[PDB]
Amino acid sequence: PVSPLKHFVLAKKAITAIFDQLLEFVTEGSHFVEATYKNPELDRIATEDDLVEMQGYKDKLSIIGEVLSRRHMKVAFFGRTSSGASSVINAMLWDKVLPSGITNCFLSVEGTDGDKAYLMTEGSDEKKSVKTVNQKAGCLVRVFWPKAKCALLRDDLVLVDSPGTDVLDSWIDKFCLDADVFVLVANSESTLMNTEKHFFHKVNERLSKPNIFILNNRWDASASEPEYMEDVRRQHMERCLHFLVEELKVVNALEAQNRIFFVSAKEVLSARKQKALAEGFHARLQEFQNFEQIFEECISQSAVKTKFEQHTIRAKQILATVKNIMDSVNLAAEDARLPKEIDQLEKIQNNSKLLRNKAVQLENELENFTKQFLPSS
Numbered sequence: 130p131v132s133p134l135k136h137f138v139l140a141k142k143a144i145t146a147i148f149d150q151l152l153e154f155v156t157e158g159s160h161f162v163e164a165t166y167k168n169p170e171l172d173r174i175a176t177e178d179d180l181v182e183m184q185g186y187k188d189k190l191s192i193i194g195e196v197l198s199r200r201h202m203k204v205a206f207f208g209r210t211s212s213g214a215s216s217v218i219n220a221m222l223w224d225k226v227l228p229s230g231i232t233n234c235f236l237s238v239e240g241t242d243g244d245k246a247y248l249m250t251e252g253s254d255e256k257k258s259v260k261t262v263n264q265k266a267g268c269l270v271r272v273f274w275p276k277a278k279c280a281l282l283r284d285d286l287v288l289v290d291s292p293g294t295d296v297l298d299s300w301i302d303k304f305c306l307d308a309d310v311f312v313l314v315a316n317s318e319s320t321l322m323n324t325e326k327h328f329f330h331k332v333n334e335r336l337s338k339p340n341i342f343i344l345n346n347r348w349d350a351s352a353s354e355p356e357y358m359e360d361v362r363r364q365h366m367e368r369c370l371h372f373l374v375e376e377l378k379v380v381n382a383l384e385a386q387n388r389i390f391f392v393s394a395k396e397v398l399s400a401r402k403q404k405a406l407a408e409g410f411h412a413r414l415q416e417f418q419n420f421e422q423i424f425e426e427c428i429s430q431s432a433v434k435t436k437f438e439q440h441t442i443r444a445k446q447i448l449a450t451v452k453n454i455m456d457s458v459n460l461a462a463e464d465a466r467l468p469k470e471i472d473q474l475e476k477i478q479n480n481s482k483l484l485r486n487k488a489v490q491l492e493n494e495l496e497n498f499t500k501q502f503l504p505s506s
């Protein structure tokens with residue numbers, strides 16, 4: 130009932146918060162180390178190498194927080210014209226966000242904070258019209274739709290439509306590695322082609338266990354028929370299971386059950402846009418809904434790990450080195466001198482212990498962050 134996407138948005142705000150505190154802390158600590166090293170009436174209590182380390186960390190953390198900021202979930206769709214990739218996307222959103230072709234470029238869909246749809250094309254910041262004015266290697270058109278109308282877009286998801294995998298070459302995927310999920314939209318009136326497989330083979334080789342879903346769309350055209358339906362499904366199931374589990378070897382048999390879905394995107398869209406019956410419209414709609422719920426669980430989870438974990442790790446290492454540096458200052462300062470110099474060294478002692486204690490606080494919070502958002506810690 131709570132969109133599983135919220136898991137990603139919550140992790141995002143938590144990890145950006147932590148890295149805010151993180152940058153503040155290492156900035157303060159750099160000043161301290163810098164003060165101590167440049168103080169001319171001390172003898173190497175803090176060193177130039179201590180200083181350079183901290184300055185490096187300050188600069189490193191600055192732009193991690195900047196890329197965390199821009200991180201989002203991405204799902205990419207592929208299919209022959211016309212298994213209905215665009216109708217699948219339009220139905221996940223609840224409107225005809227993508228009319229109606231078609232043109233050789235990737236089509237992504239993002240949310241705007243505004244109220245009006247519009248377009249943008251490579252190397253221009255002009256917001257071109259709603260889509261009306263819609264139509265030398267790869268071409269991307271970014272479509273923007275109001276967040277207030279689609280929960281998916283509000284919750285940090287980008288959907289990408291490829292041009293028909295039917296119609297030319299394959300150095301495409303540098304639009305496509307950002308993607309946390311790839312979805313093959315199949316034509317259930319036909320059979321899984323090798324041209325369809327060929328693309329996901331070249332995705333499998335450059336990505337370790339990518340998440341792949343197969344939508345056998347157009348599942349209307351096999352309606353009306355109770356016995357016929359189960360027999361054709363079993364046959365599509367075999368080719369889909371075989372492809373994922375054995376050809377792509379990207380998922381085991383029992384997992385693959387929750388990667389393959391029989392669906393009617395036309396129906397779902399029509400039913401969803403009508404909010405201001407064929408044979409088995411309800412069962413299919415439920416099925417599209419189960420897909421959404423599993424998809425959202427899968428993308429949110431995967432996206433947190435691949436986009437947030439390593440930065441979390443990096444932060445832990447950084448906090449370790451700053452603790453070692455504080456300790457080193459505290460200890461060096463512990464080692465005859467006047468009672469004027471003695472209380473200067475004591476001031477430095479407890480400033481280092483304070484700095485060191487916050488580092489430990491921030492390690493707590495980071496640990497805390499991996500428990501809530503990164504099993505199995």
Ligand SMILES: Nc1nc2c(ncn2[C@@H]2O[C@H](COP(=O)(O)OP(=O)(O)OP(=O)(O)O)[C@@H](O)[C@H]2O)c(=O)[nH]1
Nearest residue numbers: 211213214215216229230347348349393394395396
């Ligand atoms: N019968 C059936 N047709 C579908 C379904 N999904 C998409 N289509 C049709 O497949 C054709 C090509 O799919 P799309 O890529 O979605 O085409 P489109 O650009 O949206 O064109 P229109 O939907 O006609 O406006 C269209 O004519 C759709 O009507 C479906 O679930 N069932």
